[PDB]
Amino acid sequence: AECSVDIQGNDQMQFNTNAITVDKSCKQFTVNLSHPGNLPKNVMGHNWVLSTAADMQGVVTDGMASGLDKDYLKPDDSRVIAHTKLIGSGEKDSVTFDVSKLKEGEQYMFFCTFPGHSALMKGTLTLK
C-alpha cells in the first residue's frame, strides 16, 4: 500500500474491491492488476480504466467499438485518466499515474471495458 493498490479481476467478472482511495500526499499512484482465474484473455480478459463518473459510459461505448486488438479502448481517448492493458489468466499489469491529474471533489470510476463487463466490474476512486 502507500500510493498503490492491488486488484484482481476473476473468472466471475468481479473485481475484488469496489472503492479505491488515493492519498493526497502521493505524488503518483500505482494500480497493480492481476487475473487469478483460469480463463483466457479472449473469453475473460480484464483491464482497469479510470475516468470521471460522467465520462465512463462514452469510454465504455467507444472502447467496445475499438475492439479486441485495441484492448477495447479507443486509442488516445482523452477521457481516460489511466488504464492497464487487457490481461488474461495468470497475467499481471501495472499503471502508475500522477495524482495531480485528480481534483478534489470530483467523482471517478474505475471499470473494465471488455464487452459487457462494466455492468459488474466497476467501482469508485476518490482522493483522500
Task: Give the residue with the Cβ less far from Cu ion, 33 or 102.
Answer: 33
The DSSP call for residue 3 is: S
Residue 56 Cβ, how far from Cu ion at the closest point, in Å? 14
Contact criterion met (CB below 8 Å) for 47 and 85: yes
Residue 71 to residue 74: CA distance in whole angstroms: 8
Task: Give the residue with the Cβ less far from Cu ion, 48 or 108.
Answer: 48
CA dihedral 59, 72, 122, 117 (to 10 degrees): 120
C-alpha cell, 120: 459488474
Task: Give the residue with the Cβ less far from Cu ion, 55 or 88.
Answer: 88
Q: Annotated binding residue at 44?
A: no
> Can you give the binding site for a copy of itself, defined by CB under 8 A?
11-14, 39, 42-44, 64, 68, 114-116, 119-120
Instruction: Write out the binding residues for Cu cation.
Output: 46, 112, 117, 121
